[PDB]
């Protein structure tokens, strides 16, 4: 149907070749062990002989040993098959979504994608497991069942298999138009207690105008009709279990009416009637689970099929093939509007804003909304439409995946640490490149130790995941030092602290040093340092400028600089 | 434990043991058939015989109708005692739930109520049923199968029953402990996976950085680590299976060297080991449900205790026994700033505003004050927590529930009419001394005739309950429907929607004109269309008293009178 979960099993297709001698063992030890009764029937018990019982039980032993033996082996192949698929699995996938473009993970919905990988796959790997072991063992049972029943007493074999498939439409179709004569009016019932409640949700008129008598005996009428209702809830439930145990009992009557009817019938050892009896006790169980198989292996199929629609999707696509070594040209915003899903308002209306090399440009707003996609978003996540953003002649999207993401760093409260040293973590991806004494020079910069570096160890100690939990504003500042570290040419920073500025207060913006004199940066406005510290100020609120001139020309009269000015003290 | 269903099983304490003559036989019948096996094997086709081999299907049948028929006899009767017994739990719930005060419908429980007396009813009954089945069913096929060794084993299978407990003890022993074994490892499953989590939850941060070939090989050795884990997920379970088998082998095996010494094996035949043998494999089931029994019976019965809780809970008490026919006299607040149980809000006004009988006044609110809450004071749905509301010379508290009841009248946009006709609605319960007489002359000046009353089984047009919806608006006042057969003295006016109705609009003002004539009642003014045929513009509003207004103090500045016309219109 969809066999694309072939290929990957093509790794490892060994392994269910590898378990085939334990898939036909499973079932032959028990058929073969229920073979071994009509010897303690006849050949044992039937006859003074004892000699087959010297050893039998013997070999009932040594066969489950097989069995048990069988099972593990068989259960550890499926174990080999499962955790290597779905670690291939897991593999493509998760370099799937680092090349998923802004979607259901980075900001449409929650991120219970782990969830589906982490339930689903296992899901379908388990579904797959069982349904292979199921129909393998099952389907050895079968044929071995039959086996043993042909060889025995090919008659008795026939009659027995032309009587099943009586009972099974029998009990097959009884049971199905039972149910639908429960359900019928079943919903009678719910429609019944359904309008009880109204009777119920009806309280305060008859707590005020009067009626608990009528009320108790309108009550009564209705819940004798439930009683009514329940009768024959009960009186349909329990008259299909009689007839589908009459049918079942019918047919042993008419196996049994059928033997030794004909005297030629009944020249039989005797006792084989009774090990055929018990195997068809005994592969009830196996029946019943043979008949889910198909529906459980596409259900696994469909699970399979929601991670594979999850995979081959469309990555981020970078038809640019302009190499970047160093971009020292300015960033233009010339009335430029990308896309947001699920926003119908466009998600940034027309905007000039030019920020020259070495310029320190503050942007300032209220709302919020708008606020944080002007300036982290210069990173090409989210598809601009129209407008261009000139990069020394070449737009956002002439440039190749290159450098530090295309070309610039960021730092916000929400920086996720890897478990990886925390000197590698601020020497991520290039840690080749950048030697361990540079690395703890660029912590030398960061002015930290009292939190980072202060003996914990020499600089190869890491915060672990939900371990430490170094302070935010801390992991910020390490953000920065990694920044400063890979020489960011441009660089974004939210400020969302508004808390106490223990120490941050000194390197606010990396130490105010040259990554403000130099590689001009944006800043979202939080904090009357950065207010004090613009360039040119660029009043932006609701995806619209206001202002655009000097910050201390703005500063003169009120316009709208001041306004924000007012509220942020 | 709780003794509290045998008081109401008592008037039907004979349903049960009528069930249980019936289930005792149903039980033994199994047990019957199987005893058949002796005389099917050894007395039958083992000798060689016809012997009754022509009568043990017939057999089969003459006990299948004893099976059959006692089976759907004891459902009758266990669906008997049920749904009596659940129907008198539910009159006598119902009796102490309406009648018990409002705040429970009031944040307390929401909706799902319903399920708490409908749902819950049927757990507690299934509950005793199953108890019951589970109790004398399996219980008595226990005892039926057990006393196949007195009739069989004087020394020949005391030993199988000796055997079994010590099975029973190692196979619950190894299988709990293999439990902990395969559980003690899902919290590492856990942690490597939240790891994984952290991993994908840095996806911003590592596309800033663009190390996905470094997360991927991180990746990589986690993804390998829970692929160990699962394989040794999955070898717990998959060892614990031979184990456990292992046990049911050496039982055999067990069994059968004892049958290793002829010296008691002298005397069994064949088919007696046979029999033997399906006693153990029919008594699998009955076991294995008779485990849970204990659990089983305080399942829903628990359920049943918390039933009972609301069943005790106190009802509204009113020690006061005034009585009055038609009281025409003043209702007096005074200091009245309660605050209604549950939540501790911003309070009302510290109402001391009066309204006497035969002095109209109208009440004028905004924007959600509980200003309907003050109704409920005249009608003392709620508690007063401080102050006092007087009727007349006496104080709230004074009067009997009846005679405010009869006093009091209320009109709203919700009220839920009832699964009757027309006629006896707006006599919802006192109909026996108004007959239909006063039902139609209250019809003349009701003004009702057709808008949404129209002729389909004349003026006592059938009221299908949630299937007629009309509008509510028209549906429920003293002419439209009711307490002009009561003539009642005061009356809440709430006026909460506002539509473009045809003419019913000037319906509501006619039904003012005829109704405060005499009967002074309070409005709440969503609307200020009332306010224009009002006495006294009692201005309290919001939260707190702003004081006693009258029409032309307060018109002539803004205040709030005409604040509330401004915003209004």
Chains 1, 2 share one sequence.
Not at 105 to 133: P, W
Not at 175 to 198: C, D, H, L, P
Not at 352 to 373: F, Q
Request: hydrophobic content about 45%; overall charge neutral.
């Amino acid at each position: 149907t969809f066999r694309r979960l072939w290929p990957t099993i093509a790794p490892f297709k060994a392994g269910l070749i590898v378990a085939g001698v334990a898939l036909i063992l499973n079932a032959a030890s028990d058929t073969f062990m229920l073979s071994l009764l009509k010897p303690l029937l006849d050949d044992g018990f039937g006859k003074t002989d004892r000699s087959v019982l010297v050893w039998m039980p013997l070999v009932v032993i040594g066969l489950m040993i097989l069995r048990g033996i069988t099972s593990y082996v068989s259960s550890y192949c499926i174990s080999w098959v499962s955790g290597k698929v779905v670690m291939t699995m897991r593999r493509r996938l998760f370099g799937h979504m680092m090349g998923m473009p802004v979607s259901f993970f980075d900001k449409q919905s929650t991120g219970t994608l782990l969830s589906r990988i982490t339930y689903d796959s296992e899901q379908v790997a388990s579904s797959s497991s069982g349904a292979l072991i199921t129909v393998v063992r099952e389907g050895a049972s079968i044929i071995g069942l039959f086996i043993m029943m042909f060889y025995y007493s090919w008659q008795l074999s026939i009659i027995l298999i032309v009587l099943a498939p009586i009972v099974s439409i029998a009990i097959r179709v009884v049971s199905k138009r039972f149910r639908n004569i429960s359900k019928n009016m079943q919903n009678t019932m719910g429609q019944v207690t359904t309008s009880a409640e109204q009777m119920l949700k009806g309280h305060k008129e008859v707590l005020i105008f009067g009626g608990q008598e009528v009320e108790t005996k309108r009550f009564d009428k209705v819940s004798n009709r439930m009683r009514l209702q329940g009768m024959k809830m009960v009186s349909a439930s329990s008259i299909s279990d009689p007839i589908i145990q009459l049918i079942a009992s019918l047919a042993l009557a008419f196996v049994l009416y059928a033997a030794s009817f004909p005297s030629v019938m009944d020249s039989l050892t005797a006792g084989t009637i009774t090990v055929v009896f018990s195997s068809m006790i005994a592969l009830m169980r196996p029946l019943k689970s043979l008949t889910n198989v198909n529906a459980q292996f596409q259900r696994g199929m469909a699970a399979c099929q929601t991670l594979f629609t999850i995979l081959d999707s469309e990555q981020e696509k970078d038809e640019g093939k302009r190499v970047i070594e160093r971009a020292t040209g300015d960033v233009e915003f010339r009335n430029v509007t990308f896309t947001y899903p699920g926003r119908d308002v466009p998600a940034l209306r027309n905007i000039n804003l030019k920020i020259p090399a070495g310029k320190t440009v503050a942007l300032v707003g209220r709302s919020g909304s708008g606020k944080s996609t002007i300036a982290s978003l210069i990173t090409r996540f989210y598809d601009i439409d129209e407008g261009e953003i000139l990069m020394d002649g070449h737009d956002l999207r002439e440039y190749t995946l290159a450098s530090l993401r295309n070309q610039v760093a960021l730092v916000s409260q929400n920086v996720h640490l890897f478990n990886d040293t925390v000197a590698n973590n601020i020497a991520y991806a290039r840690t080749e490149q950048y030697s361990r004494e540079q690395i703890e020079e660029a912590a030398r910069m960061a002015y930290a130790m009292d939190f980072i570096n202060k003996m914990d160890n020499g600089l190869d100690t890491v915060i672990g995941e939900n371990g430490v939990l170094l302070s935010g504003g801390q992991r910020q500042r390490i953000a920065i030092a990694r920044a400063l570290l890979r020489d960011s040419p441009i660089l974004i920073l939210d400020e969302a602290t508004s808390a106490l500025d223990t120490e941050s207060e000194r390197a606010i913006q990396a130490a105010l040093d040259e990554l403000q004199k130099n590689r001009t940066s944006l800043v979202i406005a939080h904090r009357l340092s950065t207010i004090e510290k613009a360039d040119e100020i660029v009043v932006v609120e609701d995806g619209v400028i206001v202002e655009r001139g000097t910050h201390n020309d703005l500063l003169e009269h009120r316009g709208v600089y001041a306004q924000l000015h007012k509220m942020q003290f």
